[PDB]
C-alpha cells in the first residue's frame, strides 16, 4: 500500500482438474476414473541463470 509496484508471485499450489465432474468445484472429493492429461510438459523452456563469484581461503576457514 505504501508504493505501487507490480511484481510476480512465487509459491506452491494444488491444481485440481476434473472432466464432467460437478463435485470438484467446491474442492471436495477424491481423484477417480482414468487419466485425463499428462503432467509432463511438451517443451523444456531452458533458462539462462548464470552466476560467477570468487572466494578466499584461510587456515581458520
Amino acid at each position: 500500500l505504501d508504493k505501487f509496484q507490480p511484481t510476480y508471485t512465487t509459491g506452491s499450489f494444488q491444481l485440481i482438474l476434473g472432466l464432467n465432474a460437478p463435485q470438484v468445484i467446491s474442492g471436495e472429493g477424491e481423484p477417480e476414473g482414468e487419466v485425463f492429461a499428462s503432467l509432463a510438459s511438451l517443451e523444456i523452456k531452458p533458462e539462462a541463470h548464470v552466476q560467477e563469484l570468487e572466494i578466499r581461503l584461510d587456515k581458520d576457514t
Binding site: L1, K3, F4
Partner: protein, 244 residues
Amino acid sequence: RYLTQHTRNLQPGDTFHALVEPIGEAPLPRLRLTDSGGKPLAFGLIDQPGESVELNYTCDQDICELVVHVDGTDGQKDSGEAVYRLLVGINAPNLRESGQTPVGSSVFLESDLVTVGLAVDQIVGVDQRSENFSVVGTLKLSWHDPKLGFSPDQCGCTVKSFEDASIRAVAGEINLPLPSFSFYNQQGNRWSQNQVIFVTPDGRASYFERFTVTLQAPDFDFLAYPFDRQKFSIKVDLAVPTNM
C-alpha cells in the same frame, strides 16, 4: 508524499465516487482505488479542464472493502506545501451537487484514531548530577473498533476486563492489531503494577496503566544557578507507523 485512507464495507450493487480539487495551484496527483490486499480496481482520470480527477466503481462481490490512495511522490522536489480537497460518497450520484457541505449525513471512512491522557501523582526525586527525574502517574489509551464486539445475551455481562499478560493472548486469537506505546526518554526499567483493559460491546475500549519510570532531562541549564528555572518533559511515542 503518500496518503492512504480506509473505507467502510460496501453491500453488493453499491457504487463509489471520488474527486480531487486542488486549491493552492498544486500539481494534479495520481489517485487509484484498490482493496485491502492491494489488488487494483480502478484508476483516476483527468478531464479536459484539468482541475479535477474523477473515479467511479461498482462492486459485485458479497463483501467489498475499498482503499483510496493519493500519489504525490512524483511532484516538484522541495515543495513548500500542497493542500487539496477530497470528497467521497457511496450512494451519491452526481457527487458535484447536493450543496457539497463538509458536514455530511454520516461518516464514510473508518476510524483508527486514539485518544490519550496522562496524569502525574508523585515526584520521587530529582538528580542534578545525572540530570534525570522519576515520576509516578497513570496513562489512559482509548480507541474505537467495530470488531471485538460481544452480544450481551450470550454472556450476561456489560463489560469485559483483561489483566496481566492475558491481553495479548486474546488479541492473537482474533488477530486484531493493537496500539503499542513507548517512553522515548526512559532510562532503565519501568515498573508497572497494574495493566487492565475494559471492553464495551459496541466496540469501545479503554486501557489503563499505573507506572513508575525514570526519565532523562537534557534541558538542564546551570547558567543562572542557583536562581535558574528548568523544564521537565515526558514523551510518549506510538510504536506503530502513522498508517495504523
